Structures are given as C-alpha cells and as structure tokens.
Amino acid sequence: ALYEYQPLQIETYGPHVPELEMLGRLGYLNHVRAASPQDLAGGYTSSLACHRALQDAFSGLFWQP
Amino acid sequence: MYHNSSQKRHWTFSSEEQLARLRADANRKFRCKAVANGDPVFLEPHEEMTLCKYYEKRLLEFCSVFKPAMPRSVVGTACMYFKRFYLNNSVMEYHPRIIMLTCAFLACKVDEFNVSSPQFVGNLRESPLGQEKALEQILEYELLLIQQLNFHLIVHNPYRPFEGFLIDLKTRYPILENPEILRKTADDFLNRIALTDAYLLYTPSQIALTAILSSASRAGITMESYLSESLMLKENRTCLSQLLDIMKSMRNLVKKYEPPRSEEVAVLKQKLERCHSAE
Amino acid sequence: KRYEKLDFLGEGQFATVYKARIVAIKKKDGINRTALREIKLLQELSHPNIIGLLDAFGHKSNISLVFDFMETDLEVIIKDNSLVLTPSHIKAYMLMTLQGLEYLHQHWILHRDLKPNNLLLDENGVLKLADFGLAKSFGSPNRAYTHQVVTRWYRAPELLFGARMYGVGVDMWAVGCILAELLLRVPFLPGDSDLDQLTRIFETLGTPTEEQWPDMCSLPDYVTFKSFPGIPLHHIFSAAGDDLLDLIQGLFLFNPCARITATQALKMKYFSNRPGPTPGCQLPRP
Ligand SMILES: Nc1ncnc2c1ncn2[C@@H]1O[C@H](COP(=O)(O)OP(=O)(O)OP(O)(O)=S)[C@@H](O)[C@H]1O
Ligand SMILES: [Mg+2]
C-alpha cells in the first residue's frame, strides 16, 4: 500500500490552458506586465497573473446549463 | 474557479423563461401574502422588471462616482447581487433603493474592497441624518440579502476572462495585428451585455468572447479561425456550433433589450411608493 | 433551530463553537468580515482535506456556520507525549495536508494561517485544513496584500521582510515548519518577535545570500543580518532519511520562487518511498 502521485482531474469545460512553466517559452509573457524586483523577491511572477487570466478565459467556455 | 463554482451550479439558468417563471412566482407569492394579510395597488411583473432595470442603472451611477474608486469587480458583484436578489423577491416587499445600497455594501465586503461605513454613507447624496438612516437600513438588510443569495457570495465576472482572451489573441492570433484596438468597443458591448439577463444565463468566458467577437465584427475583422484552429474547435464540430449559437443568442439578447422610459419609471415609482407606504 | 446544541466545544477569537446534532456550529460595521470570508471561500471548495461548510444561518448581524465535527487537531497530537509519531504517521499527515493545499492553490487561494491547531482530525483520521479567516485569493497583479499574516512561528522570511506580493510559498514554508514540529514535537522556530523570528530562521538554516535569494534586498523591510553558517539538516533531524531531508530542504528554500509547490512536494520521492502512509483508521487517537 504505497502512495503514487495522481494529478487532480477537474473538468474545466473549456480549451486547454498551457502549463505555467511553458508560458515564457510560448511567448505569453511578452504581453503581460513584468514583475518588479520587489514582486519577484516575495515570490510573485508575471506567470501567475498570465496563467490565472488564461484559466479564467477558458473556464466553462464549452458549458451549457 | 467558475467551472466548479456555486454561480455555475445554482445561478446559471437554462432560459429566459425560467427567469420569468421565478420572477412571476415571487410577484404572485407577495400578492398572496398581501391578500391574506388585509386591486391596482399591485405591480405587474413587467413593471417590477422595469423598476429593477432602472435601479440597476442607479446602482451603476452610484458605483461610478463612489470614493474611493470602486474596482470593476466590486461593481459587477453588486450588480449580480441585485439581479439574483430580485429573481426571487418582489420590489414591493423590499425597496430596490435600499437593496442596491446593501448589494454595494456586501460586494465591497466580499471582494475585499475595505471601506468603512462612514465613508460608504458619505457617498450617498443626502443630509447626515439621511446617511445614518440609510446605514441602519443597509445593516438591517445585509443578512436578508445574504440569505436570499443562499450564502453564495463569490461572483465570477467577465473582466478577467476578457483580459485572458486578449493575452491569448496577442500570443496565438497574429492575423489580428493589434488586439488592443478591439478593447474599447468590446468593453462597450460588455456593458450592454451587463444590462440584460445574460449574466444569469451564460458563463463569464462566453460573455467575454462574445463581446470580443462583436467588437471584431464591428471593425470588419473576421475571427472564426481563432475558434476553429486556435481553440481547437475543428476537432469537435458540435462544440463550435453550440458556441456560435450561444454567441448569437447573447447578441439577440442585447438587440432586444429595451431601456426604461422616464414617464413610465415615474409612474411605477409612484406606484411602488404607494405600495410600500400602504403596507 | 433544526440543530440541537449538544455540548460546548470551546471559545475563540471571533466566534463560539458548540457540538450539535453530529456537526459543529460556530457563532455599525455590519456582518463580521472574517465570517463572510470563511463563508465565501468554503462555499466554492469541495475536497476531502478541506473543512466542509454544510450550512449557514443567523439573526441580525449574528450568524452561525455549520461544519463537519472534527474530533481533534494536529497540535493535540503533537503535544500528546503518550502518542508516538512514526514515519508512516508523519507521512500520512503530510500527505493529507499537501493534497488539501494542492487543491486550494489550484483554485488560486492562499490559506495564510497554516499551523497544527488549524489542521483538524476527525474520528476516521481524515485531516482537514480549517480556519479560513485569513485565506485570500492570489494571482491578481492589481491587488495589494499584507505581510502581517501567518502566525509568527510559521511565517515565511519574505513576509517577515515585508513582502506585499507573494504566492504559494507563504503556505509551503509554514508546511515545512509543521513538518519540523512533527519530527521534533516542539515548535521549530519559536520567535518572540519578528526580528527574533528572522534571527532564529537564519541561525538555524543559514543567512541567505543573493545567490540563494536574488532580489532579497529589494523587500521593503529588509535589514542586514550576520552571516550565520546554519546547522546541517541531518544534525537537526537525526532520524530523518535522505528523501525526507530533501523534502525539508525544498520546503525551506529561501527563494520563494524556488521553494517547492504542493504539487512538486507531492511528487517527491519521500511520499512514494517505503514505508507507505498510515491509513486514516490506524492514525494515533489522543
Ligand atoms: N469543525 C470543528 N469541530 C470541532 N471543533 C472545532 C471545529 N471548528 C472549530 N473548532 C474548535 O473551535 C476552536 C476555536 O478555533 P476556531 O473557531 O476554529 O477559529 P477562531 O474563531 O479564529 O479562534 P482561534 O483564535 O483560531 S482559537 C478550534 O481551535 C477547535 O477546537
Ligand atoms: Mg484556529
């Protein structure tokens, strides 16, 4: 009875959102405000804001009541 | 997140007929209570709807001039609270003048816009005694508003999905050379969509995408390829067809919206004042 | 009302809790903002390791919240000298805590009040994150946060240095502290002041350099400390295996971006390694 990791499977009812670590490589971060050094010191990156914006954009897009 | 939110599960309805049924039920229940308690004194459901539209406009104007400046999320949350409350309640039982202020108060608390009661009531255009009286009324109605919302306080607005779609368009849709030119008009359409029942009928992402595509069409720019390839809707034809139908229905909702008229609003306000003073 | 007040559970800062029937009921500015925050966040979350809000109601400004009845909490287990905390028990507690945190962070919410007394245990050994009075959504660039969150003993160095914008690190660091408390049975960094808290953090883990924390000097309340060398982790945790040491090191990285997230922690070798976590029914009952 050993533990194996399993990702959370929550249905979003919308288009796939790119992974957080891939946002910079895919070019999304070129269109979001850069995190200030003070922001980065506390652990806040522009990737977080971009990822949340994309997730909210795609959440429930294909859902009908 | 919207996809497992209380708004999606309990406050996104199947059709305008369901909303009309709920409002008619509320009006009928209040009429029955008044009949069993103690005529042209009663407001008709369409008259209630006209009054609700007028007082939602008043809530918008109240939030526009509010100091300190309200974030747009707070305003959207307050408007959602107003709509949801009057889905199941009659303006003859609870005056929308107090209810809209209570909605703004609760939205300020919920969306973490920290303001104190004195500065909240200083924004009301009244003498001091009026401000304290309004504050007491808001305090009395806060719990009732929370109860009538079924304790579902988190509201998902189309503003963040709109920004996310703008990011995605700037990243993956180079045909639209500068998506920022779509902003202003799209925002305009968003506001118009906010005046209808679409917020009770469609997801925030659908509303934001509809506003963006309406702005693009108004500018003579065609963007079906964004849906087809970028959003991968070529792998599911029925998904794309349903999304297009949803957008068309939302645009039709915007088209058939009729703003309240000043003379009718004055007559209905006199009727509502009479109904409240008679109770 | 429908619920009958069975027993008096305890008092609290913002409310009074009673066991009822088996649930727990928690009783000019209007309705208290802490209760509103708890209601608004718990209505939108549904996970086995997050306390469930079954009902809410009240009168005037007074409101009652109905939660699942929780038999005990992790602080009671830690302070119970009669209870022996095996590696399997610690792994099980850590696993449940991290699963709950992974869900919460996936929904863009920071708990900001993690500590053993806020991790409740039910009769069946299921651990649940509770006390969401400080919890707040994150990820919005145009929202300002406060650095005076998390109990001082569990507060991250970035918060102690006054960071106004932060992410999951403020929870993960606290998680590390909790793990340390599970291994030593005493608070890891019991500072009596913010300065003393930072001093203890640096005397234990070493004063961080710009190599380990690239923008550390930019924080509004940053002050310079002496260059402590720090104690090696295996000195502090003698019985901890190498995988557990790796997890502890990941949780206590000074750079909040490099600090491991809940998902990364869950994927670490320590959780998949032998022995497996204890089942909930076999967890120590105080
Ligand atoms: N679901 C529950 N089941 C059993 N006991 C609970 C439950 N919830 C809270 N308590 C108890 O109530 C105590 C008071 O803490 P809470 O009411 O949860 O939070 P609080 O109002 O901020 O008070 P403090 O400062 O954290 S002690 C807890 O420490 C538990 O003993
Ligand atoms: Mg507590």
Side-chain angles (χ1 to χ4, degrees), chain B residues 98-115:
Chain B
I98 316 157
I99 291 293
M100 69 166 204
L101 300 175
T102 309
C103 288
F105 191 74
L106 184 54
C108 284
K109 280 178 169 173
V110 165
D111 307 55
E112 312 273 14
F113 179 48
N114 193 12
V115 320

mmCIF file with all atom_site columns, all heavy atoms in Angstrom, chain B residues 98-115:
data_model
loop_
_atom_site.group_PDB
_atom_site.id
_atom_site.type_symbol
_atom_site.label_atom_id
_atom_site.label_alt_id
_atom_site.label_comp_id
_atom_site.label_asym_id
_atom_site.label_entity_id
_atom_site.label_seq_id
_atom_site.pdbx_PDB_ins_code
_atom_site.Cartn_x
_atom_site.Cartn_y
_atom_site.Cartn_z
_atom_site.occupancy
_atom_site.B_iso_or_equiv
_atom_site.pdbx_formal_charge
_atom_site.auth_seq_id
_atom_site.auth_comp_id
_atom_site.auth_asym_id
_atom_site.auth_atom_id
_atom_site.pdbx_PDB_model_num
ATOM 1   N N   . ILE B 1 98  ? -32.988 50.685 -1.142 1.00 0.00 ? 98  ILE B N   1
ATOM 2   C CA  . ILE B 1 98  ? -32.180 50.144 -0.054 1.00 0.00 ? 98  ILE B CA  1
ATOM 3   C C   . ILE B 1 98  ? -31.399 48.923 -0.520 1.00 0.00 ? 98  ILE B C   1
ATOM 4   O O   . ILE B 1 98  ? -30.247 48.713 -0.115 1.00 0.00 ? 98  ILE B O   1
ATOM 5   C CB  . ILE B 1 98  ? -33.069 49.810 1.156  1.00 0.00 ? 98  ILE B CB  1
ATOM 6   C CG1 . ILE B 1 98  ? -34.062 50.940 1.423  1.00 0.00 ? 98  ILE B CG1 1
ATOM 7   C CG2 . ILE B 1 98  ? -32.211 49.551 2.381  1.00 0.00 ? 98  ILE B CG2 1
ATOM 8   C CD1 . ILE B 1 98  ? -35.282 50.494 2.198  1.00 0.00 ? 98  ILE B CD1 1
ATOM 9   N N   . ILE B 1 99  ? -32.022 48.085 -1.351 1.00 0.00 ? 99  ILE B N   1
ATOM 10  C CA  . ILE B 1 99  ? -31.413 46.815 -1.733 1.00 0.00 ? 99  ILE B CA  1
ATOM 11  C C   . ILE B 1 99  ? -30.155 47.041 -2.562 1.00 0.00 ? 99  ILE B C   1
ATOM 12  O O   . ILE B 1 99  ? -29.166 46.318 -2.408 1.00 0.00 ? 99  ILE B O   1
ATOM 13  C CB  . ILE B 1 99  ? -32.436 45.935 -2.474 1.00 0.00 ? 99  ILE B CB  1
ATOM 14  C CG1 . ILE B 1 99  ? -33.520 45.459 -1.506 1.00 0.00 ? 99  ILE B CG1 1
ATOM 15  C CG2 . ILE B 1 99  ? -31.751 44.743 -3.129 1.00 0.00 ? 99  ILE B CG2 1
ATOM 16  C CD1 . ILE B 1 99  ? -33.023 44.510 -0.441 1.00 0.00 ? 99  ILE B CD1 1
ATOM 17  N N   . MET B 1 100 ? -30.165 48.031 -3.457 1.00 0.00 ? 100 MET B N   1
ATOM 18  C CA  . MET B 1 100 ? -28.977 48.289 -4.267 1.00 0.00 ? 100 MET B CA  1
ATOM 19  C C   . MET B 1 100 ? -27.806 48.746 -3.398 1.00 0.00 ? 100 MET B C   1
ATOM 20  O O   . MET B 1 100 ? -26.662 48.321 -3.611 1.00 0.00 ? 100 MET B O   1
ATOM 21  C CB  . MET B 1 100 ? -29.293 49.311 -5.363 1.00 0.00 ? 100 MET B CB  1
ATOM 22  C CG  . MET B 1 100 ? -29.556 50.733 -4.888 1.00 0.00 ? 100 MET B CG  1
ATOM 23  S SD  . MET B 1 100 ? -29.530 51.938 -6.231 1.00 0.00 ? 100 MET B SD  1
ATOM 24  C CE  . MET B 1 100 ? -29.148 53.443 -5.340 1.00 0.00 ? 100 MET B CE  1
ATOM 25  N N   . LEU B 1 101 ? -28.075 49.595 -2.404 1.00 0.00 ? 101 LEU B N   1
ATOM 26  C CA  . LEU B 1 101 ? -27.023 50.018 -1.485 1.00 0.00 ? 101 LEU B CA  1
ATOM 27  C C   . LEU B 1 101 ? -26.514 48.847 -0.656 1.00 0.00 ? 101 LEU B C   1
ATOM 28  O O   . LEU B 1 101 ? -25.309 48.730 -0.410 1.00 0.00 ? 101 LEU B O   1
ATOM 29  C CB  . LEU B 1 101 ? -27.538 51.135 -0.579 1.00 0.00 ? 101 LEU B CB  1
ATOM 30  C CG  . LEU B 1 101 ? -28.016 52.400 -1.291 1.00 0.00 ? 101 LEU B CG  1
ATOM 31  C CD1 . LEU B 1 101 ? -28.605 53.390 -0.298 1.00 0.00 ? 101 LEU B CD1 1
ATOM 32  C CD2 . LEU B 1 101 ? -26.883 53.036 -2.078 1.00 0.00 ? 101 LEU B CD2 1
ATOM 33  N N   . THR B 1 102 ? -27.419 47.975 -0.209 1.00 0.00 ? 102 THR B N   1
ATOM 34  C CA  . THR B 1 102 ? -26.998 46.782 0.519  1.00 0.00 ? 102 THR B CA  1
ATOM 35  C C   . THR B 1 102 ? -26.129 45.888 -0.356 1.00 0.00 ? 102 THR B C   1
ATOM 36  O O   . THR B 1 102 ? -25.147 45.306 0.117  1.00 0.00 ? 102 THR B O   1
ATOM 37  C CB  . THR B 1 102 ? -28.219 46.013 1.023  1.00 0.00 ? 102 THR B CB  1
ATOM 38  O OG1 . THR B 1 102 ? -29.097 46.907 1.716  1.00 0.00 ? 102 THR B OG1 1
ATOM 39  C CG2 . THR B 1 102 ? -27.796 44.898 1.962  1.00 0.00 ? 102 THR B CG2 1
ATOM 40  N N   . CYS B 1 103 ? -26.487 45.760 -1.637 1.00 0.00 ? 103 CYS B N   1
ATOM 41  C CA  . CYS B 1 103 ? -25.690 44.974 -2.569 1.00 0.00 ? 103 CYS B CA  1
ATOM 42  C C   . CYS B 1 103 ? -24.298 45.563 -2.730 1.00 0.00 ? 103 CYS B C   1
ATOM 43  O O   . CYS B 1 103 ? -23.306 44.829 -2.741 1.00 0.00 ? 103 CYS B O   1
ATOM 44  C CB  . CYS B 1 103 ? -26.393 44.893 -3.924 1.00 0.00 ? 103 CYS B CB  1
ATOM 45  S SG  . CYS B 1 103 ? -27.861 43.842 -3.943 1.00 0.00 ? 103 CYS B SG  1
ATOM 46  N N   . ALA B 1 104 ? -24.205 46.889 -2.852 1.00 0.00 ? 104 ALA B N   1
ATOM 47  C CA  . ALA B 1 104 ? -22.895 47.527 -2.945 1.00 0.00 ? 104 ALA B CA  1
ATOM 48  C C   . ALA B 1 104 ? -22.079 47.307 -1.675 1.00 0.00 ? 104 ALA B C   1
ATOM 49  O O   . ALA B 1 104 ? -20.882 47.011 -1.739 1.00 0.00 ? 104 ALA B O   1
ATOM 50  C CB  . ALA B 1 104 ? -23.052 49.020 -3.232 1.00 0.00 ? 104 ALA B CB  1
ATOM 51  N N   . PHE B 1 105 ? -22.720 47.442 -0.512 1.00 0.00 ? 105 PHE B N   1
ATOM 52  C CA  . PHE B 1 105 ? -22.049 47.229 0.770  1.00 0.00 ? 105 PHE B CA  1
ATOM 53  C C   . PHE B 1 105 ? -21.486 45.814 0.868  1.00 0.00 ? 105 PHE B C   1
ATOM 54  O O   . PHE B 1 105 ? -20.300 45.611 1.177  1.00 0.00 ? 105 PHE B O   1
ATOM 55  C CB  . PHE B 1 105 ? -23.053 47.501 1.893  1.00 0.00 ? 105 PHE B CB  1
ATOM 56  C CG  . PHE B 1 105 ? -22.452 47.585 3.264  1.00 0.00 ? 105 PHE B CG  1
ATOM 57  C CD1 . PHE B 1 105 ? -21.712 48.689 3.647  1.00 0.00 ? 105 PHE B CD1 1
ATOM 58  C CD2 . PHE B 1 105 ? -22.667 46.576 4.186  1.00 0.00 ? 105 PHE B CD2 1
ATOM 59  C CE1 . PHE B 1 105 ? -21.175 48.771 4.915  1.00 0.00 ? 105 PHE B CE1 1
ATOM 60  C CE2 . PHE B 1 105 ? -22.134 46.654 5.456  1.00 0.00 ? 105 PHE B CE2 1
ATOM 61  C CZ  . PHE B 1 105 ? -21.387 47.752 5.821  1.00 0.00 ? 105 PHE B CZ  1
ATOM 62  N N   . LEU B 1 106 ? -22.328 44.820 0.582  1.00 0.00 ? 106 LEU B N   1
ATOM 63  C CA  . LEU B 1 106 ? -21.897 43.431 0.652  1.00 0.00 ? 106 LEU B CA  1
ATOM 64  C C   . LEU B 1 106 ? -20.823 43.130 -0.384 1.00 0.00 ? 106 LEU B C   1
ATOM 65  O O   . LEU B 1 106 ? -19.900 42.361 -0.110 1.00 0.00 ? 106 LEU B O   1
ATOM 66  C CB  . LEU B 1 106 ? -23.091 42.496 0.474  1.00 0.00 ? 106 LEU B CB  1
ATOM 67  C CG  . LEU B 1 106 ? -22.779 41.008 0.614  1.00 0.00 ? 106 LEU B CG  1
ATOM 68  C CD1 . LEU B 1 106 ? -22.080 40.734 1.935  1.00 0.00 ? 106 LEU B CD1 1
ATOM 69  C CD2 . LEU B 1 106 ? -24.048 40.188 0.494  1.00 0.00 ? 106 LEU B CD2 1
ATOM 70  N N   . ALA B 1 107 ? -20.936 43.705 -1.584 1.00 0.00 ? 107 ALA B N   1
ATOM 71  C CA  . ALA B 1 107 ? -19.918 43.484 -2.605 1.00 0.00 ? 107 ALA B CA  1
ATOM 72  C C   . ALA B 1 107 ? -18.579 44.067 -2.179 1.00 0.00 ? 107 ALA B C   1
ATOM 73  O O   . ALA B 1 107 ? -17.529 43.466 -2.426 1.00 0.00 ? 107 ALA B O   1
ATOM 74  C CB  . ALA B 1 107 ? -20.367 44.084 -3.937 1.00 0.00 ? 107 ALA B CB  1
ATOM 75  N N   . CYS B 1 108 ? -18.599 45.240 -1.543 1.00 0.00 ? 108 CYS B N   1
ATOM 76  C CA  . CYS B 1 108 ? -17.364 45.812 -1.021 1.00 0.00 ? 108 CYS B CA  1
ATOM 77  C C   . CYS B 1 108 ? -16.737 44.892 0.012  1.00 0.00 ? 108 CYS B C   1
ATOM 78  O O   . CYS B 1 108 ? -15.517 44.698 0.025  1.00 0.00 ? 108 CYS B O   1
ATOM 79  C CB  . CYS B 1 108 ? -17.636 47.187 -0.414 1.00 0.00 ? 108 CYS B CB  1
ATOM 80  S SG  . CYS B 1 108 ? -17.865 48.503 -1.623 1.00 0.00 ? 108 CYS B SG  1
ATOM 81  N N   . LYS B 1 109 ? -17.557 44.317 0.894  1.00 0.00 ? 109 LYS B N   1
ATOM 82  C CA  . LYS B 1 109 ? -17.014 43.386 1.882  1.00 0.00 ? 109 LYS B CA  1
ATOM 83  C C   . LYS B 1 109 ? -16.476 42.112 1.230  1.00 0.00 ? 109 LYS B C   1
ATOM 84  O O   . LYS B 1 109 ? -15.395 41.632 1.590  1.00 0.00 ? 109 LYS B O   1
ATOM 85  C CB  . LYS B 1 109 ? -18.074 43.043 2.922  1.00 0.00 ? 109 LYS B CB  1
ATOM 86  C CG  . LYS B 1 109 ? -18.256 44.094 3.992  1.00 0.00 ? 109 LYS B CG  1
ATOM 87  C CD  . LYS B 1 109 ? -19.354 43.685 4.952  1.00 0.00 ? 109 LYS B CD  1
ATOM 88  C CE  . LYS B 1 109 ? -19.370 44.568 6.176  1.00 0.00 ? 109 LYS B CE  1
ATOM 89  N NZ  . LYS B 1 109 ? -20.538 44.277 7.045  1.00 0.00 ? 109 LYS B NZ  1
ATOM 90  N N   . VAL B 1 110 ? -17.218 41.548 0.276  1.00 0.00 ? 110 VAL B N   1
ATOM 91  C CA  . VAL B 1 110 ? -16.879 40.237 -0.274 1.00 0.00 ? 110 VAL B CA  1
ATOM 92  C C   . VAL B 1 110 ? -15.627 40.319 -1.139 1.00 0.00 ? 110 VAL B C   1
ATOM 93  O O   . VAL B 1 110 ? -14.730 39.475 -1.041 1.00 0.00 ? 110 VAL B O   1
ATOM 94  C CB  . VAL B 1 110 ? -18.073 39.663 -1.059 1.00 0.00 ? 110 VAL B CB  1
ATOM 95  C CG1 . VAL B 1 110 ? -17.633 38.500 -1.933 1.00 0.00 ? 110 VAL B CG1 1
ATOM 96  C CG2 . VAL B 1 110 ? -19.164 39.223 -0.102 1.00 0.00 ? 110 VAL B CG2 1
ATOM 97  N N   . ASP B 1 111 ? -15.547 41.331 -1.998 1.00 0.00 ? 111 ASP B N   1
ATOM 98  C CA  . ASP B 1 111 ? -14.406 41.492 -2.889 1.00 0.00 ? 111 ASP B CA  1
ATOM 99  C C   . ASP B 1 111 ? -13.230 42.204 -2.227 1.00 0.00 ? 111 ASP B C   1
ATOM 100 O O   . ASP B 1 111 ? -12.340 42.696 -2.932 1.00 0.00 ? 111 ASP B O   1
ATOM 101 C CB  . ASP B 1 111 ? -14.837 42.227 -4.160 1.00 0.00 ? 111 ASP B CB  1
ATOM 102 C CG  . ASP B 1 111 ? -16.029 41.569 -4.836 1.00 0.00 ? 111 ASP B CG  1
ATOM 103 O OD1 . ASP B 1 111 ? -17.068 41.378 -4.170 1.00 0.00 ? 111 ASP B OD1 1
ATOM 104 O OD2 . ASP B 1 111 ? -15.922 41.225 -6.031 1.00 0.00 ? 111 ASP B OD2 1
ATOM 105 N N   . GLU B 1 112 ? -13.218 42.266 -0.894 1.00 0.00 ? 112 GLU B N   1
ATOM 106 C CA  . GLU B 1 112 ? -12.077 42.753 -0.117 1.00 0.00 ? 112 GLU B CA  1
ATOM 107 C C   . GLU B 1 112 ? -11.723 44.199 -0.449 1.00 0.00 ? 112 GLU B C   1
ATOM 108 O O   . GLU B 1 112 ? -10.560 44.598 -0.373 1.00 0.00 ? 112 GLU B O   1
ATOM 109 C CB  . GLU B 1 112 ? -10.857 41.846 -0.302 1.00 0.00 ? 112 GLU B CB  1
ATOM 110 C CG  . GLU B 1 112 ? -11.154 40.364 -0.135 1.00 0.00 ? 112 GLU B CG  1
ATOM 111 C CD  . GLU B 1 112 ? -11.059 39.905 1.308  1.00 0.00 ? 112 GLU B CD  1
ATOM 112 O OE1 . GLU B 1 112 ? -11.027 40.770 2.208  1.00 0.00 ? 112 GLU B OE1 1
ATOM 113 O OE2 . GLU B 1 112 ? -11.016 38.680 1.541  1.00 0.00 ? 112 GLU B OE2 1
ATOM 114 N N   . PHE B 1 113 ? -12.722 44.996 -0.821 1.00 0.00 ? 113 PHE B N   1
ATOM 115 C CA  . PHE B 1 113 ? -12.542 46.434 -1.010 1.00 0.00 ? 113 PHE B CA  1
ATOM 116 C C   . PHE B 1 113 ? -12.860 47.095 0.326  1.00 0.00 ? 113 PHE B C   1
ATOM 117 O O   . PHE B 1 113 ? -14.010 47.406 0.634  1.00 0.00 ? 113 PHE B O   1
ATOM 118 C CB  . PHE B 1 113 ? -13.430 46.946 -2.136 1.00 0.00 ? 113 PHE B CB  1
ATOM 119 C CG  . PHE B 1 113 ? -13.308 48.421 -2.382 1.00 0.00 ? 113 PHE B CG  1
ATOM 120 C CD1 . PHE B 1 113 ? -12.066 49.018 -2.500 1.00 0.00 ? 113 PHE B CD1 1
ATOM 121 C CD2 . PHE B 1 113 ? -14.440 49.208 -2.510 1.00 0.00 ? 113 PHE B CD2 1
ATOM 122 C CE1 . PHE B 1 113 ? -11.954 50.376 -2.730 1.00 0.00 ? 113 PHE B CE1 1
ATOM 123 C CE2 . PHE B 1 113 ? -14.334 50.563 -2.741 1.00 0.00 ? 113 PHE B CE2 1
ATOM 124 C CZ  . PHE B 1 113 ? -13.089 51.149 -2.849 1.00 0.00 ? 113 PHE B CZ  1
ATOM 125 N N   . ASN B 1 114 ? -11.822 47.307 1.129  1.00 0.00 ? 114 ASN B N   1
ATOM 126 C CA  . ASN B 1 114 ? -12.006 47.745 2.508  1.00 0.00 ? 114 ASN B CA  1
ATOM 127 C C   . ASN B 1 114 ? -12.400 49.215 2.558  1.00 0.00 ? 114 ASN B C   1
ATOM 128 O O   . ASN B 1 114 ? -11.574 50.096 2.304  1.00 0.00 ? 114 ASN B O   1
ATOM 129 C CB  . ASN B 1 114 ? -10.727 47.512 3.308  1.00 0.00 ? 114 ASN B CB  1
ATOM 130 C CG  . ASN B 1 114 ? -10.939 47.653 4.803  1.00 0.00 ? 114 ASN B CG  1
ATOM 131 O OD1 . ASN B 1 114 ? -12.073 47.713 5.280  1.00 0.00 ? 114 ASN B OD1 1
ATOM 132 N ND2 . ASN B 1 114 ? -9.845  47.716 5.553  1.00 0.00 ? 114 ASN B ND2 1
ATOM 133 N N   . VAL B 1 115 ? -13.665 49.478 2.880  1.00 0.00 ? 115 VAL B N   1
ATOM 134 C CA  . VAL B 1 115 ? -14.141 50.821 3.189  1.00 0.00 ? 115 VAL B CA  1
ATOM 135 C C   . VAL B 1 115 ? -14.928 50.750 4.487  1.00 0.00 ? 115 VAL B C   1
ATOM 136 O O   . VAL B 1 115 ? -15.537 49.722 4.804  1.00 0.00 ? 115 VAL B O   1
ATOM 137 C CB  . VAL B 1 115 ? -14.999 51.425 2.051  1.00 0.00 ? 115 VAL B CB  1
ATOM 138 C CG1 . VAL B 1 115 ? -14.425 51.073 0.694  1.00 0.00 ? 115 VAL B CG1 1
ATOM 139 C CG2 . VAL B 1 115 ? -16.450 50.971 2.151  1.00 0.00 ? 115 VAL B CG2 1
#
